[PDB]
Amino acid sequence: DKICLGHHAVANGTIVKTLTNEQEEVTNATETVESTGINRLCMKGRKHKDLGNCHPIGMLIGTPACDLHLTGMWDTLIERENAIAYCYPGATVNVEALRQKIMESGGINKISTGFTYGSSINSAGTTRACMRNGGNSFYAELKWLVSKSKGQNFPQTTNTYRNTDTAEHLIMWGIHHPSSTQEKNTLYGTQSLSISVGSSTYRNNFVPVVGARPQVNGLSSRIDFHWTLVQPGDNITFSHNGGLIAPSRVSKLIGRGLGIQSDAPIDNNCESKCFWRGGSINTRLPFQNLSPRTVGQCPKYVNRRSLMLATGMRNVPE
């Protein structure tokens, strides 16, 4: 007559680490690091924009790839690989800082500057680098100004935009840098050229410069893009006599959104809070090893393939 005491065991027991032992055998264990994600961007419950072809910069200046995305509202914005910002070859100052800002926005609204030009100016220069419906064209929010009669000096012109709104506006313009003396003279005349811009918060001078360059989109010439915020109630004035790519509409960024750079296809049926290049991450685990670069409400990236947490007692087999 005796009564005994004891505990269960299993044939295959998972191995876990402990403070003093890294080969500990235990009855049960579970993963704390997530190693699988969704190869879709789970956009359910979100008002979202997939830009495809459009670079976020392209949105402000109206590149034809962006014609569908000139104005909008969203809480999520998605940038795609090899998006296009520049139809006519160029570069933008503080480009990353501006791109980040648009990606942080929850929408864009466009306001006309209201600029008007005398008979000497031709407001409607186009190019085959900016094609739009089988037709030569130009950035949709900017106007390329050239002398109406070729070779004649572009007239000294003053343009003022006044922000009559309650919130700041993002105005953009460009400085055209020709590829040759011939072309500069044809477009604006033989005169010396200066462009000065200023608001209560901005003062600068620009000068178009002629130099030979490699062709990009068939063109040796360039446009430099520049930008500033124009506070409510303030004015910004352009004084120029050849070379200004002038704004015909200004922008307004609105609210806040989450910007996402991704290779994944959209899925509007699933919903998620954590995203990366590869898609989305839906999980309960505090850690993950899919991407060191994530966005949103995500688990913490750890440098380990697996970490196992004991769910049972020591496993001592029969």
Partner 1 sequence: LFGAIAGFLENGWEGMVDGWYGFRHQNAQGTGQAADYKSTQAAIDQITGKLNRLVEKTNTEFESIESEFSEIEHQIGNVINWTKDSITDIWTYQAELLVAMENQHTIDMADSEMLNLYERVRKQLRQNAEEDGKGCFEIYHACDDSCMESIRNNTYDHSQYREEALLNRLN
Ligand X SMILES: CC(=O)N[C@@H]1[C@@H](O)[C@H](O[C@@H]2O[C@H](CO[C@]3(C(=O)O)C[C@H](O)[C@@H](NC(C)=O)[C@H]([C@H](O)[C@H](O)CO)O3)[C@H](O)[C@H](O)[C@H]2O)[C@@H](CO)O[C@H]1O
Ligand Y SMILES: *[C@@H]1O[C@H](CO)[C@@H](O)[C@H](O)[C@H]1NC(C)=O
Ligand Z SMILES: *[C@@H]1O[C@H](CO)[C@@H](O[C@@H]2O[C@H](CO)[C@@H](O)[C@H](O)[C@H]2NC(C)=O)[C@H](O)[C@H]1NC(C)=O
Ligand U SMILES: *[C@@H]1O[C@H](CO)[C@@H](O[C@@H]2O[C@H](CO)[C@@H](O[C@@H]3O[C@H](CO[C@H]4O[C@H](CO)[C@@H](O)[C@H](O)[C@@H]4O)[C@@H](O)[C@H](O)[C@@H]3O)[C@H](O)[C@H]2NC(C)=O)[C@H](O)[C@H]1NC(C)=O
Contact residues for its own copies, defined by CB under 8 A: 89-91, 158, 160, 177, 194, 196-205, 207, 209-214, 216-220, 222, 224, 234-237, 239
Kindly state the smallest distance separating residue 271's Cβ from its own copies, in Å: 24
The entry of ligand U, ligand X, partner 1, none near residue 99 (CB within 5 to 8 angstroms by kind) is: partner 1
Task: Figure out which of the listed residues 263, 304, 311, 314 binds ligand Y, where binding follows CB under 6 A.
Answer: 311
Spatial separation of the C-alpha atoms in residues 312 and 51, rounded to whole Å: 50
User: Whose structure tokens read 């956009």?
Assistant: 43
Specify the long-range contacts of residues 164-167, CB closer than 8 Å, at least 24 apart: 164/233, 165/111, 165/232, 165/252, 166/232, 167/232, 167/252, 167/254
Give residues 167-206 in contact with ligand Z (rule: CB under 6 A): 200
SS3 71: coil
Kindly state the smallest distance separating residue 205's Cβ from ligand X, in Å: 17
Give residues 70-129 in contact with ligand U (rule: CB under 6 A): none
Please give, one letter per residue, the 3-state secondary structure of 245-294: EEECEEEEECCCCEEEEECCCEECCCECCEEECCEECCCCCCEECCCCCC
62 contact partners, CB below 8 Å, separation of at least 6:
70, 139, 140, 141, 142, 249
Tell me the CA distances in angstroms from 184 to 102, 123, 240, one per residue in order: 34, 17, 15
Spatial separation of the C-alpha atoms in residues 190 and 184, rounded to whole Å: 8
Letters for 127-166 (x = contact with ligand Y by CB under 6 A, - = none) are -----------------------------------x----
Give residues 212-251 in contact with ligand U (rule: CB under 6 A): 214-215, 234-235
SS3 220: coil
- Residue 144 is a binding residue for ligand SIA (CB under 6 A): yes
Letters for 163-182 (x = contact with ligand X by CB under 6 A, - = none) are ----------------x---
Kindly state the smallest distance separating residue 130's Cβ from ligand X, in Å: 8
Cβ closer to ligand Z: 162 or 256?
162
Cβ pair 76, 51 in contact under 8 A:
no
> Which residues are at the interface with ligand SIA (CB under 6 A)?
125-129, 144, 146, 178-179, 183, 187, 219, 221
> Which residues are at the interface with ligand X (CB under 6 A)?
125-129, 136, 144, 146, 179, 183, 186-187, 218-219, 221
